[PDB]
Amino acid sequence: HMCDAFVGTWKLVSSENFDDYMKEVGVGFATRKVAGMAKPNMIISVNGDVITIKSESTFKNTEISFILGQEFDEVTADDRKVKSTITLDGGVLVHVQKWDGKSTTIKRKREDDKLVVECVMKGVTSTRVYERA
Numbered sequence: 001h002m003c004d005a006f007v008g009t010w011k012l013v014s015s016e017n018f019d020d021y022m023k024e025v026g027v028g029f030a031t032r033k034v035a036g037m038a039k040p041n042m043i044i045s046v047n048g049d050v051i052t053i054k055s056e057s058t059f060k061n062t063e064i065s066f067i068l069g070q071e072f073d074e075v076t077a078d079d080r081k082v083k084s085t086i087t088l089d090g091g092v093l094v095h096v097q098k099w100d101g102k103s104t105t106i107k108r109k110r111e112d113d114k115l116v117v118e119c120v121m122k123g124v125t126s127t128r129v130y131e132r133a
């Protein structure tokens, strides 16, 4: 029941400061522009201890499956090869990606009927708000 409130299909409805976040991460111009247009559907499911998060959009379709606290390899939508660990901290899913001596954290939170995604790279945060699809 660990992620009950996250499970479901969610659609992006707003984004703030995402271009700057992507710049800070190192994403190039053309990828930033096409990625920034995307309105993904995020599909979260749980089967036993395995959590799956899919992101489907015109830009890219991605899928990760993981166990909390157990590091895994991820190829991000912008093609970084990262080492990821996802944990639950006080009801927030905290996803840390490490690559090339850099780090970024993506937090997913349930707030009212929304799922809020906060992405941080050094001093730069972006907030992406999803609603149930």
Ligand SMILES: Cc1ccc(Cc2nnn[nH]2)cc1Oc1ccccc1
Residues within 6 Å of the ligand: 035, 036, 038, 040, 042, 055, 057, 059, 060, 076, 077, 078, 106, 117, 119, 128
């Ligand atoms: C690369 C990347 C970094 C951070 C985030 C933030 C995020 N995670 N979940 N919701 N938003 C998304 C990223 O990838 C995508 C960008 C656009 C469309 C599809 C995927």
